[PDB]
Design a protein around this ligand. Structure first.
Ligand SMILES: NC(=O)c1ccc[n+]([C@@H]2O[C@H](COP(=O)([O-])OP(=O)(O)OC[C@H]3O[C@@H](n4cnc5c(N)ncnc54)[C@H](OP(=O)(O)O)[C@@H]3O)[C@@H](O)[C@H]2O)c1
Ligand SMILES: CCc1nc(N)nc(N)c1OCCCCOc1ccccc1CCc1nnn[nH]1
Ligand SMILES: [Cl-]
Ligand SMILES: [Cl-]
Ligand SMILES: [Cl-]
Length: 187
């Protein structure tokens, strides 16, 4: 069937993830490469991963890069009547999106599911019962932000010391240090 359920996010020390429709920090090439590799790579031959994102996250991607290449793209919105141009799936909630992954059109095409933001998308996922992993890049600086990542409940999640294919040491680009973290729960 469909593979694992995952969130991926990059978060500043003040829990910020975005600012004026953009990232709060200047672009970090390798953080982007990690995001792309993690969400694109599929363990199952012939299948692609599904990325689920909110409407504002969709429109924050430059038009030339939509939809996200090599992945099935799904947008969450209650106001849009049809998937925006370049997208082919649109759901009213994360719960609806996950139910959509068991219909034939998605079931045998989708491996892993990756929630890629923004704030209210993460929130619905981290309430969702069941097996969930959070791939969290800790950007070790404050940045002025206007949208935030919900705090992790450490009574539900375990922080894994290492995760396969993920370096656990401090990264640094453009004067900005950060670390890749992986949390897991199984409600
Ligand atoms: N650092 C990171 O990892 C990261 C990741 C993603 C985005 N960002 C940045 O954060 C900002 C975009 O994120 P955002 O939080 O402001 O907006 P967003 O979550 O991407 O989009 C918000 C809209 O999407 C719909 N939506 C969101 N969650 C939903 C849910 N659970 N169920 C149904 N619909 C849902 C709603 O659309 P309707 O009003 O039409 O119903 C909502 O108004 C940008 O600045 C972006 O650059 C950062
Ligand atoms: C890399 C940031 C990030 N990192 C982690 N770990 N998780 C996330 N969910 C995450 O956000 C992804 C946001 C949706 C994909 O955004 C794309 C895709 C292609 C081109 C430009 C953008 C706009 C953001 C941007 N990235 N670099 N410059 N601009
Ligand atoms: Cl990408
Ligand atoms: Cl692949
Ligand atoms: Cl946290």
């Amino acid at each position: 069937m469909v593979g694992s359920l995952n969130c991926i996010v990059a978060v500043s020390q003040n829990m910020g993830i975005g600012k004026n429709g953009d990232l709060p920090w200047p672009p970090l090439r390798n953080e982007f490469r990690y995001f792309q590799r993690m969400t694109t790579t599929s363990s199952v031959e012939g299948k692609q991963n599904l990325v689920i994102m909110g409407k504002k996250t969709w429109f924050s991607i430059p038009e030339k890069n939509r939809p996200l290449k090599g992945r099935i793209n799904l947008v969450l919105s209650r106001e849009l009547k049809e998937p925006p141009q370049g997208a082919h799936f649109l759901s009213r909630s994360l719960d609806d999106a996950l139910k959509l992954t068991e219909q034939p059109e998605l079931a045998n095409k989708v491996d892993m599911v990756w929630i890629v933001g923004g704030s209210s998308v993460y929130k619905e996922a981290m309430n969702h019962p069941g097996h969930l992993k959070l791939f969290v890049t800790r950007i070790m600086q404050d940045f002025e932000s206007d949208t935030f990542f919900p705090e992790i409940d450490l009574e539900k999640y375990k922080l894994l010391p290492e995760y396969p294919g993920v370096l656990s040491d401090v990264q640094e680009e453009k004067g900005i240090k950060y670390k890749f973290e992986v949390y897991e729960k199984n409600d």
